[PDB]
Write an enzyme that holds these catalytic residues in place. Sequence first.
Site, mmCIF file in Angstrom:
data_model
loop_
_atom_site.group_PDB
_atom_site.id
_atom_site.type_symbol
_atom_site.label_atom_id
_atom_site.label_comp_id
_atom_site.label_asym_id
_atom_site.label_seq_id
_atom_site.Cartn_x
_atom_site.Cartn_y
_atom_site.Cartn_z
ATOM 1 N N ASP A 15 9.537 7.681 69.797
ATOM 2 C CA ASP A 15 9.559 8.456 68.514
ATOM 3 C C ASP A 15 8.227 8.407 67.742
ATOM 4 O O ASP A 15 8.162 8.825 66.583
ATOM 5 C CB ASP A 15 10.776 8.034 67.626
ATOM 6 C CG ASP A 15 10.778 6.610 67.235
ATOM 7 O OD1 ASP A 15 9.682 5.901 67.320
ATOM 8 O OD2 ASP A 15 11.874 6.191 66.777
ATOM 9 N N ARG A 29 5.207 9.603 63.312
ATOM 10 C CA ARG A 29 6.578 9.196 63.528
ATOM 11 C C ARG A 29 7.516 10.419 63.360
ATOM 12 O O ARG A 29 7.455 11.173 62.347
ATOM 13 C CB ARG A 29 6.904 8.125 62.501
ATOM 14 C CG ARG A 29 8.351 7.670 62.475
ATOM 15 C CD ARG A 29 8.826 7.015 63.740
ATOM 16 N NE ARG A 29 10.068 6.238 63.600
ATOM 17 C CZ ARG A 29 11.284 6.792 63.678
ATOM 18 N NH1 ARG A 29 11.431 8.090 63.919
ATOM 19 N NH2 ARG A 29 12.354 6.021 63.536
ATOM 20 N N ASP A 34 15.788 8.222 65.727
ATOM 21 C CA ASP A 34 15.456 6.844 66.049
ATOM 22 C C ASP A 34 15.657 6.704 67.517
ATOM 23 O O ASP A 34 16.760 6.879 67.994
ATOM 24 C CB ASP A 34 16.301 5.889 65.235
ATOM 25 C CG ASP A 34 15.817 4.452 65.354
ATOM 26 O OD1 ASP A 34 14.566 4.261 65.377
ATOM 27 O OD2 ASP A 34 16.708 3.588 65.298
ATOM 28 N N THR A 35 14.599 6.411 68.235
ATOM 29 C CA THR A 35 14.679 6.048 69.658
ATOM 30 C C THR A 35 14.767 4.521 69.773
ATOM 31 O O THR A 35 14.379 3.808 68.880
ATOM 32 C CB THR A 35 13.462 6.534 70.471
ATOM 33 O OG1 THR A 35 12.239 6.236 69.799
ATOM 34 C CG2 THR A 35 13.511 8.097 70.715
ATOM 35 N N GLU A 37 13.553 0.911 70.875
ATOM 36 C CA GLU A 37 12.221 0.344 71.108
ATOM 37 C C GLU A 37 12.085 0.177 72.629
ATOM 38 O O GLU A 37 13.091 0.103 73.342
ATOM 39 C CB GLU A 37 12.032 -0.986 70.399
ATOM 40 C CG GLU A 37 12.213 -1.002 68.870
ATOM 41 C CD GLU A 37 11.224 -0.142 68.097
ATOM 42 O OE1 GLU A 37 10.047 -0.109 68.506
ATOM 43 O OE2 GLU A 37 11.643 0.538 67.106
ATOM 44 N N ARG A 75 1.879 6.245 58.838
ATOM 45 C CA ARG A 75 2.242 7.200 59.884
ATOM 46 C C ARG A 75 2.592 8.529 59.313
ATOM 47 O O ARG A 75 3.335 8.625 58.341
ATOM 48 C CB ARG A 75 3.436 6.663 60.722
ATOM 49 C CG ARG A 75 3.222 5.299 61.343
ATOM 50 C CD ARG A 75 4.396 4.856 62.169
ATOM 51 N NE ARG A 75 5.587 4.707 61.342
ATOM 52 C CZ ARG A 75 6.745 4.251 61.797
ATOM 53 N NH1 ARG A 75 6.880 3.854 63.075
ATOM 54 N NH2 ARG A 75 7.792 4.274 61.000
#
Length: 129
Positions: A15, A29, A34-35, A37, A75
């Site tokens: 992401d 970002r 939300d991917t 980690e 970001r």
Amino acid sequence: LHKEPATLIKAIDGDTVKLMYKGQPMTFRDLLVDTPEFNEKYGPEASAFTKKMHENAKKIEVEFDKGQRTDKYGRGLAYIYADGKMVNEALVRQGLAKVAYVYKGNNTHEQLLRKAEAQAKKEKLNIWS
Ligand SMILES: Cc1cn([C@H]2C[C@H](OP(=O)(O)O)[C@@H](COP(=O)(O)O)O2)c(=O)[nH]c1=O
Ligand SMILES: [Ca+2]
């Protein structure tokens, strides 16, 4: 909302990505997702997915929403497109990200992404398996 140019500097993970925007290097970002980690389940697959999507694209574009354009970590916060296909949406459609971090003022594409998530969940893809 409108799309603006950028060029890939480097894949990072599911992401985030390093792009050149207005001639400056920035980490972006992806809004509204939300991917996992990289060290988590489906993290590698998410990172592979976006690496390929960004590296294969002839044209990367960024699309800022109506609200804050950078987060507290510096970001960029954007919708990212690869040859006109939204990476944020594609991740969700494939069950490689959840809709997440939906802050008011930056949620133009929420309902688009929620529709993708529903279809991913119906299909039991990846995170939803
Ligand atoms: C997607 C997004 C993340 N964030 C911040 C919230 C989270 O803060 P915390 O780091 O304090 O948890 C973090 C989640 O990003 P990551 O999922 O990349 O870690 O980034 C925003 O502030 N705005 C956003 O739109
Ligand atoms: Ca993440």
